[PDB]
Design a protein around this ligand. Structure first.
Ligand SMILES: [Cl-]
Ligand SMILES: [Cl-]
Ligand SMILES: [Cl-]
Ligand SMILES: [Cl-]
Ligand code: NA
Ligand code: NA
Ligand code: NA
Ligand SMILES: [Zn+2]
Lengths: 356, 352
C-alpha cells in the first residue's frame, strides 16, 4: 500500500504538477516506502495526477512490482525520467531538498532547465510526523514482537557471552516472533561500555557484575520499535539501583506532562530539572527522545532545542539517560503516542533492572 | 596518513549528520558514530560532535574533539572557520544535501566551495594494508558462518530461512552487520542473476546460489558459493565446471596494470567458447571497501589500468532461465606480479 493519494491532494492544492523522489543508496528510503510501498535502496519515483512511476535497476525490478501498484521501469535515470516529465507536460516538480545531494540537484537542474522545482520538505515531514491509526497499529506490532523476543532472550544472557552474541540472539529471536527486519544495529553495552550513550554491540566479553544497557527494536510492515532496558549480571549495586531509580522517575515526570500542545523542549526540561537537582546534571543524556515510524530517527525531536508545539498522534520516545564516564550508564526508553489530554504508552516491558 | 595525503583549498569539510557522510567520517578520522562535523587542513584536524559521542570520538580518533553543548552546530562551525581564516572549502558535494548546503552558504557568507568527490573516491580505491586486514576479517567471519550454516540446511526450508540463519550466525561470529541482504536463490530462481531470497522452499537436487557478506569494522565481504542438497546432476556439474574455469582464467592474469576490460573479456570469451555466451552475466566484478559497491568496476567499459591494492570481486556466472544458474565469487587484492585471493572457501559445490 501507499499514501500517494494524500500526496497528490497536497501538491494539487498548490498547483504543483508532480512530486519527484530520488532514492539512491537509500537516500530517500522512507519517502519511497511511504509514498510507493517499495522498500529497496534504489527508486526514482514520479507521482502526479493519474501517474505513478517507479524507476529502479535489475536488482529490484521484480520486488518493486510485488510491493507497489506503480508503473515500474528498469534502467543513469535522468534521461529516462525526462522523457516522462516531458510527455506528461509536467512543469512544476516538488522535491525534498533535504534528501537530494548538491551534486545530484545540479545534475537535475541542468537537465531540467525549463522546469520549476519546489521544496516540500516541511509538508512531507508534517505528513509523516502525524501517524494514522493504521501506522500506530504497525508500530505497536513491532513493539510487541520486540518485547516478546526480549523476554525470551534475557534469561539466556550470561557471563562469557560477547555483546554481539547477545545482540545476535535477540535479533534472531525477534525474527522468530515475526520481525521482518531490525530497525537499527542492536546496542548491547556492558560494564564500562554502558557509559557510552550510543555505541554498538562489540566483541567485548560480558563479565559477572556487569550492568548492560540494551537498546533494540524490530521492524514490522515497515514500522519501527525502539526500546531500551537494563540487565544486570547478578544483583546490581546500591549505586546502580539509585541511578536507575532517578532515570525512571525522570522518565515518569516527562510522561506526566505530555499532551498535545506540549513542546519537545518542555518535555526534555522536566526530566532535565529533576535529574540536575538530584546532582546528576553533568551525566544527563543529550536529548530526551526522538520520533519513530518508518525510521528510528524522525520527527519530533524531544530535545532542549525543539520549541515546536506537538500535535496529537505524533509518536516518539522518552528515554532519559545518566552516564557515569568510566563506570556505567543507565537508560530506559518507552515509545509513546501523543494524545489530546495526555499520552498513550505503547511499550509494556517492566522497567526494573532485569537481574540474570 | 589519509588527511595528510588529501591535504588553493584551505580546508576540507565533512558533514556527517544522521550518517549522511559516514564513510568519509570513518575513512578520515576513524570515528564510527552518526554525527560528526569534521574540518581538515594543514594545521587542523577537528571533529565536532555532541555528548552522544564525545567519549567515543576520543577513543576512536586522534582528532581534536569539540563538543557542541549549546545552540546549532553550524554556529560553532561558523565560529571555527572564521577564527581559522578559512576562505576556500572542499566538499564531497555528492554527500551534502541541497538544503544543508544552503544553510552553510548563508552561515559562512563569503566562502568559496570546491567539490573533491572524485579525488576522495580515488583515495578509497587503493587500500592500505590495514583496510585489507579488516576486509579479510569480514571475510573470515563470513566463511566460518557459511560452513556452520551449510551443515544445518534442511530440505523443506525456505530461501529466507537459510538467509536468516546465515546472518544470525555471522552476527554471533563477530559481524558488525551485513554488507547487503543475503541472497539465497534455489532451483529455477538460481537462474536469476539478481533473484533475492524468497519464501520458495529448497528441495533435494536444487542448485542453491548463496551470495553473502558480513561487515567488520565498517569494511565488507562479498562472497558467492553454490550448495546442493544431494549430489548434483551431471549438467549442474558441467556448468559449474565452466564457471569455475572462466573465473580461473581471469584470476590467472590478474595483476597490477591489467584492465577490468581484459579480465572481463577473458572470462566471457571462455564461456562463449564453451557454448554459454548467451547466458553470461553482464559484469565480471566490482570493488569493495567501506561500501559493497565501489571502484574499480571490472567490466567491458572500464579500460583503465588497475593499480596495486585495489580490492574487487571476480564473479562470472552462467544463468539458464527456467533451469538453474551458477555464480562463484572471490574477493581479491591486486598485486605487482599477481593477485591475493582473500576468500578461502572451496569453490566446489557444497553437497549436503
Ligand atoms: Cl497533564
Ligand atoms: Cl541542565
Ligand atoms: Cl485518539
Ligand atoms: Cl558553489
Ligand atoms: Na514465543
Ligand atoms: Na499527563
Ligand atoms: Na583519541
Ligand atoms: Zn534509543
Amino acid at each position: 500500500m501507499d499514501r500517494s493519494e494524500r500526496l497528490i491532494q497536497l501538491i494539487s492544492e498548490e498547483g504543483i504538477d508532480a512530486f519527484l523522489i530520488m532514492n539512491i543508496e537509500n537516500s530517500a528510503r522512507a519517502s519511497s516506502v511511504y509514498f510507493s510501498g517499495f522498500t529497496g535502496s534504489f527508486s526514482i519515483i514520479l507521482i502526479s495526477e493519474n501517474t505513478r512511476l517507479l524507476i529502479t535497476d535489475s536488482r529490484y525490478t521484480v520486488q518493486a512490482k510485488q510491493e507497489t501498484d506503480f508503473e515500474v521501469r528498469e534502467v543513469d535515470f535522468i534521461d529516462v525520467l525526462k522523457k516522462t516529465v516531458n510527455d506528461l507536460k509536467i512543469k512544476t516538480i516538488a522535491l525534498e531538498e533535504e534528501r537530494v545531494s548538491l551534486s545530484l540537484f545540479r545534475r537535475i537542474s541542468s537537465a531540467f532547465g525549463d522546469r520549476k522545482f519546489i521544496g516540500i520538505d516541511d509538508e512531507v515531514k508534517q505528513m509523516r510526523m502525524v501517524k494514522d491509526e493504521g501506522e500506530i497499529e504497525k508500530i505497536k506490532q513491532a513493539i510487541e514482537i520486540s518485547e516478546r523476543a526480549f523476554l525470551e532472550t534475557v534469561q539466556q544472557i550470561r557471563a562469557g557471552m560477547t555483546e554481539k552474541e547477545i545482540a545476535a540472539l535477540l535479533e534472531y529471536t525477534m525474527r522468530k516472533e515475526g520481525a521482518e527486519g531490525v530497525a537499527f544495529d542492536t546496542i548491547v553495552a556492558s560494564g564500562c561500555r554502558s557509559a557510552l550513550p550510543h555505541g554498538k554491540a562489540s566483541d567485548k566479553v560480558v563479565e559477572r557484575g556487569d550492568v548492560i544497557v540494551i537498546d533494540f527494536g524490530a521492524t514490522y510492515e515497515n514500522y519501527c520499535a525502539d526500546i531500551t532496558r537494563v540487565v544486570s549480571i547478578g544483583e546490581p549495586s546500591d549505586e546502580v539501583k539509585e541511578v536507575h531509580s532517578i532515570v525512571l522517575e525522570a522518565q515518569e515526570r516527562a510522561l506526566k506532562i505530555a499532551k498535545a500542545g506540549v513542546t519537545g523542549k518542555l518535555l526534555d526540561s522536566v526530566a532535565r530539572e529533576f535529574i540536575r537537582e538530584k546532582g546528576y546534571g553533568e551525566f544527563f543524556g543529550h536529548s530526551l527522545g526522538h520520533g519513530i515510524g518508518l525510521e528510528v530517527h524522525e520527527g519530533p525531536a524531544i530535545s532542549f532545542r525543539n520549541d515546536s508545539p506537538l500535535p496529537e498522534n505524533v509518536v516518539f520516545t522518552v528515554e532519559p539517560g545518566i552516564y557515569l564516564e568510566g563506570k556505567f550508564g543507565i537508560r530506559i526508553e518507552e515509545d509513546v503516542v501523543l494524545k489530546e489530554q495526555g499520552c498513550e504508552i505503547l511499550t509494556t516491558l517492566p522497567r526494573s533492572i532485569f537481574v540474570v
